[PDB]
C-alpha cells in the first residue's frame, strides 16, 4: 500500500518560515515525481510544487515561486516543502502527493494544516445582528450575533443560555486577513416576541477564558 504522511503543520506568523515533510512508503519513492498541493479552508485545491524522481528539477506555482523550496531525500523516502516569507494567503491544508506523471497526483497524504497569522490569543468582540425593522411587523424575524476578531478557534454560541435552540444556526468561522477569526450565529424567532422576549447570544471563547453575553435588540429606527 502506498502511504504518504505529512507532518510539520502549525501556526506561523507572516514573514515567518515553516518546513513541511512527508514520509512515503509502499512504492519505489525514487522512481516517482512527488508534489505538494494545498487547500485554504473551505476553498479549492491548488498545486504548490513538484520535484523530479532524482530531484534534478523542482517547480513551483507562481504564488510560491521563490518563497518555497521543495526537496526530496530518496534514501529516506522523504519529501519536503520549505516555506518562507509566509502570508495569510498561504493558510491552507498542505498535501503530500505522488505525481505519476504530468501533474497527476495518484496518491495523497491526509494533509497538514498551516495557519499563517500574527495573532495571539484574543477574546471576541460580539456585535448584535438586530432583526430587520421590516420583518418586525409580524411573522418571523432573523436575528443573530456577529462574533468578531478572536483567536484561536473555537468559540461556541448558545442563545438564552441554552433555552433557545430551535432555528439556531451557528456558522463556521472565517479567517480574516487580519489573522483573526469571525463567525455569526443566527436564530429565527416570532416577530411578536421582539418587544417582550429578550434574546441573548452567549459566546464562549475558552482559549481566552472569555464569555460574552450580548443582548440582541430591535433597532430604534
Amino acid at each position: 500500500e502506498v502511504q504518504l504522511v505529512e507532518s510539520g503543520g502549525g501556526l506561523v506568523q507572516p514573514g515567518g518560515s515553516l518546513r513541511l515533510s512527508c514520509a512515503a512508503s509502499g512504492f519505489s519513492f525514487s522512481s516517482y515525481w512527488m508534489s505538494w498541493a494545498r487547500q485554504a479552508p473551505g476553498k479549492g485545491l491548488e498545486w504548490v510544487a513538484n520535484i523530479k524522481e532524482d530531484g534534478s528539477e523542482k517547480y513551483y506555482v507562481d504564488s510560491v515561486k521563490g518563497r518555497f523550496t521543495i526537496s526530496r531525500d530518496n534514501a529516506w523516502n522523504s519529501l519536503y516543502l520549505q516555506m518562507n516569507s509566509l502570508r495569510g494567503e498561504d493558510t491552507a491544508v498542505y498535501y503530500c502527493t505522488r505525481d505519476r506523471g504530468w501533474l497527476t497526483f495518484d496518491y495523497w497524504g491526509q494533509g497538514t494544516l498551516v495557519t499563517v497569522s500574527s495573532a495571539s490569543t484574543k477574546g471576541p468582540s460580539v456585535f448584535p445582528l438586530a432583526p430587520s425593522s421590516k420583518s418586525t411587523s409580524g411573522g418571523t424575524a432573523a436575528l443573530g450575533c456577529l462574533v468578531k476578531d478572536y483567536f484561536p478557534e473555537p468559540v461556541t454560541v448558545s442563545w438564552n443560555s441554552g433555552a433557545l435552540t430551535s432555528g439556531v444556526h451557528t456558522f463556521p468561522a472565517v479567517l480574516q486577513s487580519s489573522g483573526l477569526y469571525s463567525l455569526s450565529s443566527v436564530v429565527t424567532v416570532p416577530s411578536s416576541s421582539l418587544g417582550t422576549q429578550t434574546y441573548i447570544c452567549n459566546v464562549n471563547h475558552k482559549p481566552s477564558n472569555t464569555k460574552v453575553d450580548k443582548k440582541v435588540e430591535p433597532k430604534s429606527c
Partner: protein, 212 residues
C-alpha cells in the same frame, strides 16, 4: 483557469456529467486531465487520470472523456457516497486544479435559499468597523455562489464566504461577509448580497441611509 460548473446533482441511480473547460494549451493540447474526488474533511482521491483511466479500486461507474478544450467526468448510477467535491486537474494549467464542482446526490427536495442581509450594527460602526453579514439559509442542494455589489457594481475585495454546511433541519446554510471601513460603508447608496443557487439568483439590498 480550468472552469467547472459550481454544482451538479442527480438522484441515486441517475447519471451526472460535470465539465472541465480549459484552453487549447492545456486540455486541448494534452491528454493529461485528471479528476479528484474530495469528501468533507478528507484528502482528495484520484478518480480519473490521463483523461479516462481509473486507478484500481475506483468503481467503473466513474468515467472520463475529453472533447476539444473540455474534459468531462460522468458518474453513471450515482450512489450517495458519490456526493463530494470533484476537481479536474490538467498538466499545463498554472495551478493544475479546476475550480471544483459540488456534486450532490439528491436526498431531499430542492429548497430555495432565504437570504438575510444585515447592515453594519451601530455598535460595530462605533467600534470603527463595518461588516455586512449575508446569511443564506434553508437551501438544498448545498451549493451556492455569493457575489456582492456596491451601487450595482461587483465588489470582490473584502469578501469572505463560508462553505455551505448543514442546518439542523438538514437543509444548508452559508454566510458571507463584506468587511468595510465605516467611511466605505457610508460612501455608497446601496450594497447587495447576491446568491446564485441552482442557476437562479436571489439578491438582498441594504442602504446606509435605510433602516434595514
Amino acid at each position: 483557469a480550468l472552469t467547472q460548473p459550481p454544482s451538479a446533482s442527480g438522484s441515486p441511480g441517475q447519471s451526472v456529467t460535470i465539465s472541465c473547460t480549459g484552453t487549447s494549451s492545456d486540455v486541448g493540447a494534452y491528454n493529461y486531465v485528471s479528476w479528484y474526488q474530495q469528501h468533507p474533511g478528507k484528502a482528495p482521491k484520484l478518480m480519473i487520470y490521463e483523461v479516462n483511466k481509473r486507478p484500481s479500486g475506483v468503481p467503473d461507474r466513474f468515467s472520463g472523456s475529453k472533447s476539444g478544450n473540455t474534459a468531462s467526468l460522468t458518474v453513471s448510477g450515482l450512489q450517495a457516497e458519490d456526493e463530494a467535491d470533484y476537481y479536474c486537474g490538467s498538466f499545463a494549467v498554472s495551478s493544475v486544479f479546476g475550480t471544483g464542482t459540488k456534486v450532490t446526490v439528491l436526498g431531499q427536495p430542492k429548497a430555495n435559499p432565504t437570504v438575510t442581509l444585515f447592515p453594519p450594527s451601530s455598535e460595530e460602526l462605533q467600534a470603527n468597523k463595518a461588516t455586512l453579514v449575508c446569511l443564506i439559509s434553508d437551501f438544498y442542494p448545498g451549493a451556492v455562489t455569493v457575489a456582492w455589489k456596491a451601487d450595482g457594481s461587483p465588489v470582490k475585495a473584502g469578501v469572505e464566504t463560508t462553505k455551505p454546511s448543514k442546518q439542523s433541519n438538514n437543509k444548508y446554510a452559508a454566510s458571507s461577509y463584506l468587511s468595510l471601513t465605516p467611511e466605505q460603508w457610508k460612501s455608497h447608496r446601496s450594497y447587495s448580497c447576491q446568491v446564485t443557487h441552482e442557476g437562479s439568483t436571489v439578491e438582498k439590498t441594504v442602504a446606509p441611509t435605510e433602516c434595514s
